[PDB]
């Protein structure tokens, strides 16, 4: 039992973390087969970030400029290509440690693991959620650009995130591995407003089921509410509106606990309206929304890999 | 920027995680060189846990009984030894993936990363702290015995925890890798009193420094207090008493922010007495004590390993 924020095992991804330097700006890259993926603003300086012409800037770049390091193996970069905001450096040798990998675009509210690296070296792994406004609340210093987010299923590593820049607001934005940004952000260092952020309701219910499985049960009332009536209260407190698809995916936790999804919604109504009254849930005084229904199931059943 | 609870990259440890079975009781083990470390109550049944004679039970065990699995490799167990609550198995093959590793006993208040495994396969990694009463609040289902906790410095993996059993109370207990328990616990499934738990004060100050480094500054008062006057207030709210060694190790965070440690203590005193008044710190309504000063330094400067 017990319930912690769990991150995927990071071994498969460490073997792909390289350092890429182009001039005086050095950030991380992801080395799969004979290609190294990194953010295209590696070819900018601080002063180039205001209004970069990435097409012309890349044209001034030569393969010799791209210092790619693997631990301290130096890789002869033999090509450069621009796919959206991502720079694919063709290299001499294929990475012998290449895992089975997919390139996946995720949805707001889904969670992934982030391997934080600086100068091509991994320093930490942590779980985070793609907020509904497509930002992440992250741990990225200057030089953790190119750090990737991934999920793990069976033998396959599912790459979904690459970090590019910190926003003025202190939040982070990035792309899929085809280089398309999540959200309305771009790779310039300019004023960039994120959306009004909302709370991932379906994650919150799944976290409440997790708390019932782990003993914390004080928030259970003998109420119930309609889905359409629950949303009236959801909007008011800036919660994402619950759908029937969100109810359906909560089914399995509703089965394990014998608490109908709407019953659990009725407790959340009580929670949004009355607060926590000084109590906690799994040792937290706020409602947590960084666990998917899938994550809780994998933690209350022991889902493994390999 | 941003400040998340981070775990060490788990690659070095994933490669030593095996499955160990003895009858119908199966848990995880740690394969370093030609020895596999696992908790000795693997040689027990459910009914053996009440009052086990581990010496006589092991004598009744033969190497043919110990089913060790590494991925899909079956390992010849060729010997058995009892070091305290840990059973050291000889095997045919040295682990080709053996990292640089240490066997370290840690102190209360220090933190480590745990690679959670079930049936010998790694499933998750998370950061956690050894409480002052020598328990951990962890994510351990049934079959997560033998899962280890570790720190990483430079190239070296510092093994400090093996999990053994869930207490009645819902918290977990374990040993160092020489098999001596942390805290007064034993590997019997009996009523076991935990200590009165305290909040790791020096961890809380380091997390407060982390908050100023990341912009959250509302809790800074222009007050101050003495170390002995702060400790009077520490006792009342069940905080560990701050020592001068604790002040000294906050020195570097005190330097980066220009807020004297006693000044930060005076902010925390005010925090204990009046609460948070509906505000948060790094997006949390409770005081966090699962970060050492060393952890905050490693995240506010970007310390790596490689």
Residue numbers in the entry:
A (entry chain B), B (entry chain A): 1 to 306
Per the authors:
Crystal structures of 11 Mpro mutants provided structural insight into their altered functionality. We employed crystallographic structural analysis together with a high fidelity FRET activity assay by our group to assess the functional and structural changes in Mpro mutants. The crystal structures of several variants revealed the changes in side chains orientations of residues in the active site comprising substrate binding pockets, especially S2 and S4, which might lead to altered amino acids preferences. Accordingly, changes in KM values for most of variants were observed, indicating alterations in a mode of substrate binding. We observe the highest level of conformational plasticity around the S2′ and S3′ binding pockets with N142 and S46 being the most flexible residues within the structures we solved. Also, we observed that the charge distribution in the active site changes quite dramatically even upon a single substitution especially around the S3′ and S2 binding pockets. This might explain why with most mutants we see the changes in binding affinities and not the kcat values.
SARS-CoV-2 Mpro is a cysteine protease that forms a dimer composed of two protomers. Each protomer comprises the chymotrypsin and 3C-like peptidase domains I and II (residues 10–99 and 100–182, respectively), with the active site consisting of a Cys145-His41 catalytic dyad located in the cleft between the two antiparallel-β-barrel domains. Mpro cleaves the polyproteins at 11 positions with a consensus cleavage sequence Leu Gln | (Ser, Ala, Gly) to release nsp’s, which are required to assemble the viral replication-transcription complex. In addition to the indispensable role in viral replication, SARS-CoV-2 Mpro also plays an essential role in escaping antiviral defense by cleaving host cell proteins.
